[PDB]
Design a protein around this ligand. Structure first.
Ligand code: NA
Length: 129
């Protein structure tokens, strides 16, 4: 599923991401835009053999099991394919665990390079919510 901007903002709000660990909703919408272009089916392979999955591009080296990242962890206790669903619940619940690990949203390279320090509330302007 490819989300609309306000459609995704509403879904993340419903799932409790607005101000989660201090990150306003616009941060999460900005991260999703540049990580995945709002596409729940996005995948990208990394140099170390791991793969990033879903609308927030969660990585198989630590957070999910894809059966092909040897010596990796599965800290969200979930198959990576669950991160590709049109239902974003699994992605949001796993992202809550990531952002709570000490490094905040710096875990998402696109957020650090393209959202951090910008007017992130622009990403939810015009939305009803
Ligand atoms: Na893994």
């Amino acid at each position: 599923k490819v989300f609309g901007r306000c459609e995704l903002a509403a879904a993340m709000k419903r799932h409790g991401l607005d101000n989660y660990r201090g990150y306003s909703l616009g941060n999460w919408v900005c991260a999703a835009k540049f990580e995945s272009n709002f596409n729940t089916q996005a995948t990208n392979r990394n140099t170390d053999g791991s793969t990033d999955y879903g609308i927030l591009q969660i990585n198989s080296r630590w957070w999910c099991n894809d059966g092909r990242t040897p010596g990796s962890r599965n800290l969200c206790n979930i198959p990576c394919s669950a991160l590709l669903s049109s239902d974003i619940t699994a992605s949001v619940n796993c992202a809550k665990k990531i952002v709570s690990d000490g490094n905040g949203m710096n875990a998402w390279v696109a957020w650090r390079n393209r959202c951090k320090g910008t007017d992130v509330q622009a990403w939810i302007r015009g939305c009803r919510l």
